[PDB]
Nucleic acid binder design. Structure first.
Ligand SMILES: [Mg+2]
Ligand SMILES: [Mg+2]
Ligand SMILES: [Mg+2]
Ligand SMILES: [Mg+2]
Ligand SMILES: [Mg+2]
Ligand SMILES: [Mg+2]
Ligand SMILES: [Mg+2]
Ligand SMILES: [Mg+2]
Ligand SMILES: [Mg+2]
Ligand SMILES: [Mg+2]
Ligand SMILES: [Mg+2]
Ligand SMILES: [Mg+2]
Ligand SMILES: [Mg+2]
Ligand SMILES: [Mg+2]
Ligand SMILES: [Mg+2]
Ligand SMILES: [Mg+2]
Ligand SMILES: [Mg+2]
Ligand SMILES: [Mg+2]
Ligand SMILES: [Mg+2]
Ligand SMILES: [Mg+2]
Ligand SMILES: [Mg+2]
Ligand SMILES: [Mg+2]
Ligand SMILES: [Mg+2]
Ligand SMILES: [Mg+2]
Ligand SMILES: [Mg+2]
Ligand SMILES: [Mg+2]
Ligand SMILES: [Mg+2]
Ligand SMILES: [Mg+2]
Ligand SMILES: [Mg+2]
Ligand SMILES: [Mg+2]
Ligand SMILES: [Mg+2]
Ligand SMILES: [Mg+2]
Ligand SMILES: [Mg+2]
Ligand SMILES: [Mg+2]
Ligand SMILES: [Mg+2]
Ligand SMILES: [Mg+2]
Ligand SMILES: [Mg+2]
Ligand SMILES: [Mg+2]
Ligand SMILES: [Mg+2]
Ligand SMILES: [Mg+2]
Ligand SMILES: [Mg+2]
Ligand SMILES: [Mg+2]
Ligand SMILES: [Mg+2]
Ligand SMILES: [Mg+2]
Ligand SMILES: [Mg+2]
Ligand SMILES: [Mg+2]
Ligand SMILES: [Mg+2]
Ligand SMILES: [Mg+2]
Ligand SMILES: [Mg+2]
Ligand SMILES: [Mg+2]
Ligand SMILES: [Mg+2]
Ligand SMILES: [Mg+2]
Ligand SMILES: [Mg+2]
Ligand SMILES: [Mg+2]
Ligand SMILES: [Mg+2]
Ligand SMILES: [Mg+2]
Ligand SMILES: [Mg+2]
Ligand SMILES: [Mg+2]
Ligand SMILES: [Mg+2]
Ligand SMILES: [Mg+2]
Ligand SMILES: [Mg+2]
Ligand SMILES: [Mg+2]
Ligand SMILES: [Mg+2]
Ligand SMILES: [Mg+2]
Ligand SMILES: [Mg+2]
Ligand SMILES: [Mg+2]
Ligand SMILES: [Mg+2]
Ligand SMILES: [Mg+2]
Ligand SMILES: [Mg+2]
Ligand SMILES: [Mg+2]
Ligand SMILES: [Mg+2]
Ligand SMILES: [Mg+2]
Ligand SMILES: [Mg+2]
Ligand SMILES: [Mg+2]
Ligand SMILES: [Mg+2]
Ligand SMILES: [Mg+2]
Ligand SMILES: [Mg+2]
Ligand SMILES: [Mg+2]
Ligand SMILES: [Mg+2]
Ligand SMILES: [Mg+2]
Ligand SMILES: [Mg+2]
Ligand SMILES: [Mg+2]
Ligand SMILES: [Mg+2]
Ligand SMILES: [Mg+2]
Ligand SMILES: [Mg+2]
Ligand SMILES: [Mg+2]
Ligand SMILES: [Mg+2]
Ligand SMILES: [Mg+2]
Ligand SMILES: [Mg+2]
Ligand SMILES: [Mg+2]
Ligand SMILES: [Mg+2]
Ligand SMILES: [Mg+2]
Ligand SMILES: [Mg+2]
Ligand SMILES: [Mg+2]
Ligand SMILES: [Mg+2]
Ligand SMILES: [Mg+2]
Ligand SMILES: [Mg+2]
Ligand SMILES: [Mg+2]
Ligand SMILES: [Mg+2]
Ligand SMILES: [Mg+2]
Ligand SMILES: [Mg+2]
Ligand SMILES: [Mg+2]
Ligand SMILES: [Mg+2]
Ligand SMILES: [Mg+2]
Ligand SMILES: [Mg+2]
Ligand SMILES: [Mg+2]
Ligand SMILES: [Mg+2]
Ligand SMILES: [Mg+2]
Ligand SMILES: [Mg+2]
Ligand SMILES: [Mg+2]
Ligand SMILES: [Mg+2]
Ligand SMILES: [Mg+2]
Ligand SMILES: [Mg+2]
Ligand SMILES: [Mg+2]
Ligand SMILES: [Mg+2]
Ligand SMILES: [Mg+2]
Ligand SMILES: [Mg+2]
Ligand SMILES: [Mg+2]
Ligand SMILES: [Mg+2]
Ligand SMILES: [Mg+2]
Ligand SMILES: [Mg+2]
Ligand SMILES: [Mg+2]
Ligand SMILES: [Mg+2]
Ligand SMILES: [Mg+2]
Lengths: 146, 100, 63, 202
RNA sequence: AGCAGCGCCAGAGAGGGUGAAAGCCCCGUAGGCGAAAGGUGGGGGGAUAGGUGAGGGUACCCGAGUACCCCGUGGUUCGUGGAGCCAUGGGGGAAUCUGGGCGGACCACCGCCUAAGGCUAAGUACUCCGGGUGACCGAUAGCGCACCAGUACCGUGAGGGAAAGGUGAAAAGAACCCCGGGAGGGGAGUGAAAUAGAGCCUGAAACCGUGGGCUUACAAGCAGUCACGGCCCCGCAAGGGGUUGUGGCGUGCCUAUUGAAGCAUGAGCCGGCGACUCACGGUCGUGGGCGAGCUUAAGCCGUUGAGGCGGAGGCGUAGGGAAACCGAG
RNA sequence: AACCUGGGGAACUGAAACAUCUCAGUACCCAGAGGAGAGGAAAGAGAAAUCGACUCCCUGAGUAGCGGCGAGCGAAAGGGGA
């Protein structure tokens, strides 16, 4: 294979449009033709009408903030036992983060749909319904404590 | 500095153009313009003279300078490049495969 | 560089898991005085928007 | 394909390989583009109406002057004035996905091998950095020089050889890049270098 | 130095120059040497300054207008907020380890750290200066300055601030004669070339002129177009070129406007300069890699137009609720 | 030349008016340092019976939070590096 004919396979096409020409996009810009098309219109996405923005809706969100900021609290990662049943051996937070769906998330909590393979599953929390599937063919190793 | 180059005042061959092949002693070497005076390129100046003193100056076809690249030094064997060998003390220049 | 999330709109609008935008019913805090029990109840729940829904999406983008 | 030609003092024992079959022309291109774009250097720069020697004083009143209407000379409509959207320096590189870097690499080699040009040598009579030697070795190697050759090898002496030779491009083992591969007609690489090529992919 | 013939070097086939297109002609390049003198120099070595302990009693010392409190303010993401911490202009004003500050009012609990004296290299920033490299510019560009430019010129001054590059390979730069006061020409002469002859390569356009062809003094016009005829011009003819006599038809270009030939805007004419870009983030589409996974950032190693390493981190695999919490709900 | 540190410190502009706010501790005036300057061995961080001077980069994160809760503004711990 030589340097000729590796070119983009018929769809890269850096065909950017040129607005000053005389045919296509002409006198005025691509689109324009009027006024307040010249340097920049307000936002306008979230913003402009000139009237009360749609900001008429209201902040229910409580706890929306506080001076010192956020409170350090344990974060539980929902991990379904359907993907858990995928591999087999002895599932612990170590494994699920080493490769899977933990991502250093503070805590592990298996739960939900899927069918439970037989094995010890060490987690920090179990859904009531999740405890059933694994109980019906496995061990329920709860979290730490100290 | 570094202005130095090929040969000096001695015997040399001319591999130029209008005077290709010719051979002769280089009577002058001006390093500034990187040209040397041999006996080849000699053109006829019509001028009486630039300075009024001495009425008759010469329609002389005197020697015209020549780019120091078209001329090559020479020895027993005709036309040779220039190697250099440090003597038992000084610094002499041997030719392609001989001495001086 | 790096669009900033519009805090004012995050503080009052949650985007659904699909792509819809929800918020609380307007006019339930002040005008109140004595409105049909229907009203104050109808005003408790949240709703979906329409076109500007897409407008507000374009703010909480990193969010 | 599989069976690659191998060269050694003992003879032409043709071995085999594991390189893929399907060659995506486009993918290859992306990688070649990526190499050529990363090497670019955004050295091209021009001075904006801002960065330019001229003053700031308004040149005329703009009223009952009868002249046109202007500010400072630095304005872009003012021969000598600042440039409009003139190029500033900027980086032309990007992070092409690693998976692809490997893909292309294999596919390049594979391609060159499928044409039957990939020769895995081993014997090198070229003792020292002497072009003559390599010129001889290559002569008996089937490399008359009628074909550009990407000589890949760990030995820096073998480098010395083909180094100056025009119709050849020396290169280290890790230097393997689809550009230089595709660039040349023939590919010749030491078995020890084929092992390290095998390490990245094999 | 092209082309043909026969050779050769290459740890050097980067590049530049030589009358045009040279690895081997010249300067270089690869590779390799080199400092009496000045500068630099813990990288290697040497020396000195300095520093190094266990258990018990005593409770002497451990940085003061300081801590701390209050009034006024500053800094921080913190706009007086529930407002701490740090800093301090004003007033009050301690203790030395049962001392004292902090962990976002305050209190108790648990833990952290020792204020009110000072010094400390490296990693970091920049580029007047030197060098290297460019999908950087090529004299309206590029620095304001390729050229004796921060000049000429302008302004009381601060300050403003230009224009202006190129004979040829070599000056061989045109002796001598002729016209002319000179300038400038005409011969002669140099040169491959002189409409390359000296602000001299190329030498476009507007604009001025000389010669020739068609044409015009009863004619009405956005200057053209369609037709026929005549005159001149290339071809033997068929054809084609130029010009315009008569007939038909016919309201400039742009802008702006409901509407312009418009007595609405802009434009003396030519040449050159001149306006939708890039960076980061976003959203849709599209080409391709991989797939319940996908992907790296600084940086390190390599290279000197080579890549590789680096999973920290990001997006995705679960949602719902203000939240506690619960979870295929 | 620029970089740096301290003392002093704007307005246009944004908010589609404007006064808090923004522009910005930017522009600039001033004093001082040097091949750098600043900072620097905890009366620290802040929730881990954890970390262990300082600076610089990546990240954390447009998160936490600040805000005529408008326009906007925007940390730190921790993790990867020099
Ligand atoms: Mg079009
Ligand atoms: Mg638009
Ligand atoms: Mg504007
Ligand atoms: Mg505007
Ligand atoms: Mg507007
Ligand atoms: Mg209104
Ligand atoms: Mg004399
Ligand atoms: Mg005479
Ligand atoms: Mg749904
Ligand atoms: Mg209320
Ligand atoms: Mg009421
Ligand atoms: Mg009722
Ligand atoms: Mg209710
Ligand atoms: Mg995020
Ligand atoms: Mg300026
Ligand atoms: Mg100036
Ligand atoms: Mg101005
Ligand atoms: Mg001004
Ligand atoms: Mg006026
Ligand atoms: Mg006028
Ligand atoms: Mg201009
Ligand atoms: Mg200029
Ligand atoms: Mg000018
Ligand atoms: Mg300029
Ligand atoms: Mg990298
Ligand atoms: Mg080569
Ligand atoms: Mg030819
Ligand atoms: Mg080289
Ligand atoms: Mg050639
Ligand atoms: Mg050459
Ligand atoms: Mg050298
Ligand atoms: Mg020496
Ligand atoms: Mg030495
Ligand atoms: Mg010294
Ligand atoms: Mg010394
Ligand atoms: Mg020394
Ligand atoms: Mg040192
Ligand atoms: Mg000692
Ligand atoms: Mg001892
Ligand atoms: Mg005691
Ligand atoms: Mg005591
Ligand atoms: Mg005492
Ligand atoms: Mg005492
Ligand atoms: Mg004191
Ligand atoms: Mg306090
Ligand atoms: Mg404040
Ligand atoms: Mg405060
Ligand atoms: Mg502040
Ligand atoms: Mg601030
Ligand atoms: Mg307030
Ligand atoms: Mg005080
Ligand atoms: Mg005491
Ligand atoms: Mg005491
Ligand atoms: Mg005491
Ligand atoms: Mg004690
Ligand atoms: Mg005591
Ligand atoms: Mg507390
Ligand atoms: Mg305790
Ligand atoms: Mg503490
Ligand atoms: Mg102390
Ligand atoms: Mg340093
Ligand atoms: Mg420099
Ligand atoms: Mg010019
Ligand atoms: Mg010009
Ligand atoms: Mg100069
Ligand atoms: Mg000069
Ligand atoms: Mg002037
Ligand atoms: Mg004057
Ligand atoms: Mg001026
Ligand atoms: Mg010339
Ligand atoms: Mg001259
Ligand atoms: Mg000259
Ligand atoms: Mg003359
Ligand atoms: Mg003549
Ligand atoms: Mg002539
Ligand atoms: Mg003449
Ligand atoms: Mg002419
Ligand atoms: Mg000419
Ligand atoms: Mg003449
Ligand atoms: Mg003259
Ligand atoms: Mg020329
Ligand atoms: Mg004229
Ligand atoms: Mg005239
Ligand atoms: Mg008429
Ligand atoms: Mg005929
Ligand atoms: Mg015809
Ligand atoms: Mg007519
Ligand atoms: Mg209209
Ligand atoms: Mg008119
Ligand atoms: Mg008018
Ligand atoms: Mg008007
Ligand atoms: Mg107009
Ligand atoms: Mg006019
Ligand atoms: Mg005009
Ligand atoms: Mg970014
Ligand atoms: Mg983008
Ligand atoms: Mg959409
Ligand atoms: Mg895309
Ligand atoms: Mg397809
Ligand atoms: Mg990967
Ligand atoms: Mg980054
Ligand atoms: Mg190493
Ligand atoms: Mg390196
Ligand atoms: Mg190289
Ligand atoms: Mg999610
Ligand atoms: Mg369900
Ligand atoms: Mg203001
Ligand atoms: Mg407003
Ligand atoms: Mg106003
Ligand atoms: Mg501020
Ligand atoms: Mg200040
Ligand atoms: Mg330093
Ligand atoms: Mg320092
Ligand atoms: Mg210091
Ligand atoms: Mg300090
Ligand atoms: Mg200090
Ligand atoms: Mg700190
Ligand atoms: Mg930095
Ligand atoms: Mg980022
Ligand atoms: Mg704030
Ligand atoms: Mg603020
Ligand atoms: Mg600010
Ligand atoms: Mg950190
Ligand atoms: Mg660190």
């Amino acid at each position: 294979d030589l340097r000729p004919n590796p070119g983009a396979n018929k769809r890269r096409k850096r065909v950017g449009r040129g607005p000053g020409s005389g045919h296509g996009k002409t006198a005025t810009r691509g689109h324009k033709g009027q006024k307040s098309r010249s340097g920049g219109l307000k936002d306008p996405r979230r913003f402009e009408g000139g009237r009360s923005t749609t900001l008429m809706r209201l902040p229910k969100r409580g706890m929306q903030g506080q001076v010192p900021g956020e409170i350090k609290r344990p974060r539980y990662q929902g991990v379904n036992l359907k993907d858990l049943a995928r591999f087999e051996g002895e599932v612990t937070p170590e494994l699920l983060v080493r490769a899977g769906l933990l991502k250093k998330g503070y805590r592990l909590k298996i739960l939900g749909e899927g069918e439970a393979k037989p094995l010890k599953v060490v987690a920090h929390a179990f859904s009531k319904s999740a405890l059933e599937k694994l109980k019906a063919a496995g061990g329920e190793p709860v979290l730490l404590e100290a | 500095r570094v202005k130095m180059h090929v040969k000096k005042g001695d015997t040399v061959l001319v591999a130029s153009g209008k005077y290709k092949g010719r051979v002769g002693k280089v009577k002058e070497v001006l390093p500034k313009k990187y040209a040397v005076i041999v006996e080849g390129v000699n053109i006829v100046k019509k001028a009486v003279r630039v300075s009024p003193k001495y009425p008759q100056g010469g329609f002389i076809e005197k020697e015209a300078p020549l780019h120091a690249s078209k001329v090559r030094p020479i020895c027993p064997a005709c036309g040779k490049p220039t190697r250099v060998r440090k003597k038992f003390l000084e610094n002499g220049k041997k030719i392609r495969v001989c001495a001086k | 560089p790096k669009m900033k999330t519009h805090k004012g709109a995050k503080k009052r609008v949650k985007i659904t898991a699909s792509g819809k935008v929800v918020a609380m019913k307007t006019g339930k805090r002040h005008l109140n005085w004595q409105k049909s029990g229907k009203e104050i109840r109808q005003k408790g729940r949240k709703f979906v928007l329409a076109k500007p829904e897409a407008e507000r999406i374009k703010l909480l983008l990193p969010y | 394909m599989y069976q690659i030609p191998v060269l050694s003092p003992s003879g032409r024992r043709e071995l085999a390989a594991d390189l893929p079959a399907e060659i995506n022309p486009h993918l290859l291109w992306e990688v070649v583009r990526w190499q050529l774009a990363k090497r670019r250097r955004g050295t091209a720069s021009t001075k904006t109406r801002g960065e330019v020697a001229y003053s700031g004083r308004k040149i005329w009143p703009q009223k009952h002057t009868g002249r046109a209407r202007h500010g400072d000379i630095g304005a872009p409509i003012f021969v000598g004035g600042g440039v409009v959207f003139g190029p500033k320096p900027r980086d032309y590189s990007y992070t092409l996905p690693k998976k692809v870097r490997k893909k292309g690499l294999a596919m390049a080699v594979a391609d060159r091998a499928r044409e039957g040009k990939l020769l895995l040598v081993e014997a090198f009579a070229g003792v020292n950095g002497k072009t003559k030697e390599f010129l001889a070795w290559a002569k008996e190697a089937g490399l008359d020089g009628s074909e550009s050759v990407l000589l890949v090898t760990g030995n820096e002496l073998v480098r010395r050889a083909a180094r100056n030779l025009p119709w050849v491009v020396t290169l280290a083992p890790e230097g393997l890049n689809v550009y230089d591969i595709v660039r040349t007609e023939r590919l010749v690489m030491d078995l020890d270098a084929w092992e390290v090529f095998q390490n990245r992919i094999g």
